Amino acid sequence: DKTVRWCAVSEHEATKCQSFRDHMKSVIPSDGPSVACVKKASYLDCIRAIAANEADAVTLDAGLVYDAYLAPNNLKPVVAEFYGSKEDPQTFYYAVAVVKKDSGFQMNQLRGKKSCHTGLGRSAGWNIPIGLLYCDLPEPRKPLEKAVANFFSGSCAPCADGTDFPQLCQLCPGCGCSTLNQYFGYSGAFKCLKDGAGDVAFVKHSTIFENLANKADRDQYELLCLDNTRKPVDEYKDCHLAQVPSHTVVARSMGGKEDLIWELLNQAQEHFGKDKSKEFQLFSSPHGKDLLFKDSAHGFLKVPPRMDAKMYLGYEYVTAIRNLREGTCPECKPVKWCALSHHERLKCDEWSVNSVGKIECVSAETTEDCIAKIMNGEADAMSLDGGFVYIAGKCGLVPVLAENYNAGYFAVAVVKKSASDLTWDNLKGKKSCHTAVGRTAGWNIPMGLLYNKINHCRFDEFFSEGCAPGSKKDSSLCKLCMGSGLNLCEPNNKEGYYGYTGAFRCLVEKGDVAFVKHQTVPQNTGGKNPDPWAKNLNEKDYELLCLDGTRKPVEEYANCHLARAPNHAVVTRKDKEACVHKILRQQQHLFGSNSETKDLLFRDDTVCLAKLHDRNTYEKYLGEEYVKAVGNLRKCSTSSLLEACTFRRP
Ligand SMILES: [Fe+3]
């Protein structure tokens, strides 16, 4: 059967689920999804039912999405409700801390201030901010209200126990837990800030825009960012306490039935969603409000399949809620490097013991997996080609240090000297060799420039065929690759045409043009590479294509390159930027210019790890022209990590 067992948490919900069930049968054909209805006592019982394979799907708030993820439940987000409208779907809100312009303090200076909260137990106004501040609170941290009462000098915390903790009600005596209290709710807590009762209001990104129509007034307010800087109120995407999904359908991590759940809900919205005007409506009920889904919902969006709960909720949210649940606080130290192979891990392990605890190791199977571990705190750092820096950046990470070899390396187009027809001005129908799709030298620069000439990124229809590792297996740009079985066209070492050397090899054996870096040909000719494919080559037999339309010798790269590559760079989270900057310079003065295979963790061209100063953003580090190019190449991107991050921040 293709049945989705929907979990209801009340009798009114099960009634709506049964109506849902019955109406779907009229509009979905026999080979299509159907609905079964399971009634449990609570959200938590539903989570357990689904983990136990007694049900399949339930829609949850953020907090319960977190509970659902924890062992032994192991559920994940699969479909999101959206709001507002189809043109600009709203899936998330942002919890923010709003303050007055010129009030003279940062997030790490909130102790002693006056706070305005929407209400005790509410997410944006209490659980998140207090969650994030948890370890700043004085001991004993239980009971929580007492500890908060002794952190802020006074507050309005609606619904708090002012009798036992009067500080929490200084700004709203009684701590009224209703609209009768002028400082209750989102508009209430903002008002508490605006009227000068408090110094900080813990509310939503939209709260200020709903209460202040004129920009001139909003310019008198700012937001506290967790890096202890301030930003304008319309920049909440880069300055929030947490990003929070409004309502999320979850399901088993393995065994599903993700695709069935989406097929069901997508067809349900199409026949019974917003403004469909049938007797049955998905987003309302005669039996009650917010049954199964929120009545305000306008539809559903499929959650990208790479997404897990921690990535969906985000690192900020998870930190906040972890603190609340676990109640654990520390008493700088170990940087967790991410390895991508057994040989990367072996160098890392012996680095760890050589560093004396200062460095530790974690491994993942691909770069993206390693990036995701950095985003969620399972790891802290790794070094990346410019193309992965962009992806890391879109995913919220920052570059901290750049690999130096000597402005960085040159991306060049290599060709065989014999075939003296080839020029940059027309490579249409020729055979191309790339390091990998999405890398600086192999793709982003050359195809970036190419995009401007042809105005599309279907490069498998420009070149006759090629090898560009990471392409779709049925693409003409996997035809020249050499990997066997499942390894064919894979962006890793089991594919011999992957990477700088690989792409040059590809040119030598099969291609017409290879997109690599300036030192690749010199290093793989003249006997320096002893492998049979390179041993007997000399660099004089290869030439570079210049932007002119002319050609030049390989040593002449400085006047015959496509563009300057931004260097490979170490990336991490903003909250570890300082510690990573410190520990690596302290480690490279000990183990720098003063791997057992090739280019493990860092390139072997790397002489030092260099300061970035003001270029600690992916946009500022890569430069605008590089970012523009990659932007245009996304239209044809197949990176599932990038798809997941962009779902959360388009
Ligand atoms: Fe590179």
DSSP states along 512-566: SEEEEETTHHHHTSTTSS-SHHHHT--GGGEEEE-TTS-EEEGGGGGGS-SEEPP
Domain count, the chain: 4
Q: Which residues contact 169 (CB under 8 A, 6 or more apart)?
A: 155, 156, 157, 160, 162, 175
Are 537 and 646 within one domain? no
Is 606 marked as binding a ligand?
A: no
Distance CA(116)–CA(100), nearest Å, equals 13
Q: What does 282-342 look like in DSSP terms, one character per residue?
A: TT--TT-SS-SS-TT--EEEEPPTT--HHHHH-HHHHHHHHHHHH--------EEEEE-SH
| Chain centroid to CA 562 | 30
State in Å: Cα 564 to ligand 1 middle. Answer: 11
State in Å: Cα 375 to ligand 1 middle. Answer: 22
State in Å: Cα 439 to ligand 1 middle. Answer: 6
State in Å: Cα 591 to ligand 1 middle. Answer: 23
Q: List, as ranges, residues with CB under 5 A of the ion ligand 1.
A: 385, 440
State in Å: Cα 385 to ligand 1 middle. Answer: 4
| Chain centroid to CA 408 | 26
Distance CA(544)–CA(562), nearest Å, equals 10
State in Å: Cα 436 to ligand 1 middle. Answer: 10
Are 240 and 101 within one domain? yes
Strand order in the sheet with 608-611: 382-384, 569-572, 398-404, 608-611
Is 369 marked as binding a ligand?
A: no
Is 93 marked as binding a ligand?
A: yes
Nearest to 428 by CA among 458, 462, 451, 402: 462
Are 194 and 297 within one domain? no
Is 405 marked as binding a ligand?
A: no
State in Å: Cα 610 to ligand 1 middle. Answer: 16
Which domain-ending residue is among 244, 263, 283? 244
Is 551 marked as binding a ligand?
A: no
Distance CA(166)–CA(40), nearest Å, equals 40
Is 564 marked as binding a ligand?
A: no
Are 393 and 364 within one domain? yes
Nearest to 546 by CA among 533, 568, 562, 528: 562
Query: Are 129 and 107 spatial neighbours (Cβ–Cβ below 8 Å)?
Result: no
Nearest to 158 by CA among 147, 170, 150: 170
Scored b (16 or more CB within 10 A) or e, 59-84 reads bbbbbbbbbbbeeebbbbbbbbbbbe
Nearest to 367 by CA among 465, 437, 461, 262: 437
Scored b (16 or more CB within 10 A) or e, 246-277 reads bbbbbbbbeeebbebbbbbbbbbbeebbeeee
Which domain-ending residue is among 531, 565, 599? 565
State in Å: Cα 566 to ligand 1 middle. Answer: 8
Instruction: Output 611-618 pairs: Cβ under 8 A, ≥24 positions apart.
Output: 611/401, 611/581, 612/399, 612/400, 612/401, 612/402, 612/569, 615/399, 616/398, 616/399, 616/400, 616/577, 617/393, 617/398, 617/399, 618/389, 618/390, 618/392, 618/393, 618/394, 618/397, 618/398, 618/399
Scored b (16 or more CB within 10 A) or e, 479-499 reads bbbbbeeebbbbbbbebbbbb
State in Å: Cα 137 to ligand 1 middle. Answer: 45
Coil/strand/helix, residue 413: strand
Integer-rounded Cα radius of gyration of the chain: 28
Are 348 and 490 within one domain? no
| Chain centroid to CA 405 | 29
Is 409 marked as binding a ligand?
A: yes
Is 122 marked as binding a ligand?
A: yes
State in Å: Cα 147 to ligand 1 middle. Answer: 50
Distances in whole angstroms, Cα of residue 570 to Cα of each of 270, 353, 419, 567: 46, 21, 40, 10
State in Å: Cα 441 to ligand 1 middle. Answer: 6
State in Å: Cα 222 to ligand 1 middle. Answer: 39
State in Å: Cα 151 to ligand 1 middle. Answer: 48
CATH number of residue 520's parent domain:
3.40.190.10
Is 322 marked as binding a ligand?
A: no
Are 373 and 311 within one domain? no
Is 434 marked as binding a ligand?
A: no
- Which residue reads 């006074």 in tokens? 154
State in Å: Cα 586 to ligand 1 middle. Answer: 25
Q: DSSP label at 127?
A: I
Distance CA(456)–CA(449), nearest Å, equals 11
Length of the chain: 650
Is 247 marked as binding a ligand?
A: yes
State in Å: Cα 351 to ligand 1 middle. Answer: 23
Are 65 and 209 within one domain? no
Distance CA(108)–CA(643), nearest Å, equals 33
Query: Are 145 and 267 spatial neighbours (Cβ–Cβ below 8 Å)?
Result: no
State in Å: Cα 265 to ligand 1 middle. Answer: 42
Query: Are 440 and 387 spatial neighbours (Cβ–Cβ below 8 Å)?
Result: yes
Coil/strand/helix, residue 55: coil
Is 441 marked as binding a ligand?
A: yes
Distance CA(262)–CA(255), nearest Å, equals 14
Other CB atoms within a 10 A radius of the CB of residue 478 amount to 22
Are 424 and 545 within one domain? yes
Q: Which domain holds residue 596?
A: 332-408+566-650
Which domain-ending residue is among 186, 217, 244? 244
Is 61 marked as binding a ligand?
A: yes
SS3 content of the chain, % helix, strand, coil (to 5): 40, 20, 45
State in Å: Cα 517 to ligand 1 middle. Answer: 8
Other CB atoms within a 10 A radius of the CB of residue 332 amount to 10
Scored b (16 or more CB within 10 A) or e, 357-368 reads ebbbbbbbeebb
State in Å: Cα 500 to ligand 1 middle. Answer: 8
**Ramachandran angles phi, psi of 449, nearest 5°:** -65, -35
Is 423 marked as binding a ligand?
A: no
Are 424 and 519 within one domain? yes
Structural gaps in the chain: residues followed by a C–N separation over 2.5 Å: 331, 406, 594
Distance CA(450)–CA(458), nearest Å, equals 11
- Is the torsion defined by CA of 516, 519, 523, 526 positive or negative? positive
Are 28 and 73 within one domain? yes
Is 442 marked as binding a ligand?
A: yes
Q: Which residues contact 601 (CB under 8 A, 6 or more apart)?
A: 337, 339, 344, 347, 348, 351, 382, 383, 595
Nearest to 644 by CA among 210, 311, 195: 311
Query: Are 199 and 205 spatial neighbours (Cβ–Cβ below 8 Å)?
Result: no
State in Å: Cα 473 to ligand 1 middle. Answer: 23
Other CB atoms within a 10 A radius of the CB of residue 559 amount to 10
State in Å: Cα 541 to ligand 1 middle. Answer: 24
Nearest to 276 by CA among 298, 260, 261: 298
Query: Are 635 and 457 spatial neighbours (Cβ–Cβ below 8 Å)?
Result: yes
State in Å: Cα 447 to ligand 1 middle. Answer: 14
Is 568 marked as binding a ligand?
A: yes
Are 117 and 196 within one domain? yes
Are 147 and 238 within one domain? yes
Experimental method used, please? X-ray
Which amino acid is located at 66 in the chain?
Y
Distance CA(550)–CA(564), nearest Å, equals 18
